[PDB]
Amino acid sequence: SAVKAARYGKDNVRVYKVHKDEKTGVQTVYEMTVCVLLEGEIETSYTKADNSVIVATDSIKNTIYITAKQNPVTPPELFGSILGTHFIEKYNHIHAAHVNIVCHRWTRMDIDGKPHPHSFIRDSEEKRNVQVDVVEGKGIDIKSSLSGLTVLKSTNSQFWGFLRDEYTTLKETWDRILSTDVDATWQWKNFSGLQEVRSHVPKFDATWATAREVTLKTFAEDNSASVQATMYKMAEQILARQQLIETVEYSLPNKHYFEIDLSWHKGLQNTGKNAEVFAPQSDPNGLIKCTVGRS
Template identity: 65%
Template sequence: MAELTSARYGKDNIRLYKVHKDPTTNIQTVVEMTVCTQLEGAIDTSYTAADNSVIVATDTQKQSVYILAKQHPIAPPELFAALVGQHFVDSYPHIHAAHVSIVQHRWSRLLVDGEPHPHSFIRDGEETREVAAVVRDGQGASELQGGGAKGITLSSAIDKLVVLKSTGSAFHGFHRDEYTRLPETWDRILSTSVRARWGWKHFGSVDAVRAEVGEFDRAWKVAREVTLSTFATDNSASVQNTMYKMCEAILGAVGGIENVSYTLPNRHYFEVDLSWHKGLKNTGGDAEVYAPQTDPNGLIDCTVSRKGLKAKAKL
């Protein structure tokens, strides 16, 4: 006998762009994002009995996102995600939870003759700002469906922030056995594509999220600045130790954050031995030419939480 134990559905890759036009200054501000919505609740019969009456069409979800974007600010993305999720839970009594994910794409204001241009922008990297929100009405929240208390759970992230430093990183003293070939090094290139995530305290309502609205942009700036400054200045003994320092600093700077996670893949640069060509020296202290690698690569991950708090599951 079969039993449906988990179900949700929605609309992915909703592309959204909004421009804010300040009539007093003629300065325009743009935000571009990709939104995903998924709903869960009393929808089992749509799967088990071909009952489409319980389905809020995915096109309806898409149109709702556009209408809400017209009616409300979409920055910061944490508040917009909470608004979108709350809309679905409030509008449809049989929908008990809404999952909203947002990827905000990077546009920076263009400088012309050293001055910020009022309406021109540049995509200066593939870095993204991300948000995941789950809004629950407290009903039908089974553990298999990722159940939780009534209210709003939020997490934020930075992804695809690519950094490199040409020195100031070492890796030695690690465990060695019969399978180990990696030599120890006291000076190496360190490069990674940063994914940093932080989980917020639980919010009881959209109004509670709105009351903290200034903290979301501040936290993103703090996380980004901590990541960049720690990466640059830490005399890194390992990626593990450096990422732990980043987590500690962010928790110390933003009180509303309960946990911080980093995922840092190694982007390796290997010395090229050129000694075969007339004894050309290009290893150790003489190394200047390197071969960037794609895979395989190291992948280091950690979550640091405030003492006494269990880390939230990654959204």
């Protein structure tokens, strides 16, 4: 037998960083969870008890903190690229570094209508993420995403005209609730190295902002024919607004809210045009995916 694939490293590394402007007093905080997994000429650690090839995961952890001390942690695309590049440059025998970063929200508080210099609120469990794959000889591949953006619209969602056969019980509808948790990923053009990533730094925050804005506005404004049709519109708009993106992927649960027929109780009318009280369904859920690229 032989090792066909291997990677290893440190997961779930929580990291906070503060920036303090001593002139203005304004402080800014960043909090992440980081995973770094390495690949390379490490097979003998598995096959021969050869630990000499292992950069200890504890050392990978130390390196994450050191790198955060010595570099900006924002945008996460940049920090992940710096971190991944470090491992392939420092260790001859390491040939790929796979860096995942989850960024947690710390939004500055407004107190009495004024932004506070050092107090923050977790205003959403929504995350901003990156997956940065630094592969020796093959540059830097970056996937950026937003996830855990939970939304609901109470009308202007429809679902009719779907296939009907002997397995079908679902009624067509022209007016339903639509709710989802948005997971949206944009995949960047391959970058040749850290210089090229740095050269595009402003585009990372700008493209995240675009993706979020497009997601919310399209969700709110599209009189939706289906989750499929709405998510495609989001993706095509994001592609149109950043040429350095190659694809946009959405993964959307359809978090169902069922009508409750109450007509058995005193003829109460709570369906169709009279539907006011609904039963949110925890499970099961539709799950709708697509990846959109350019033609």
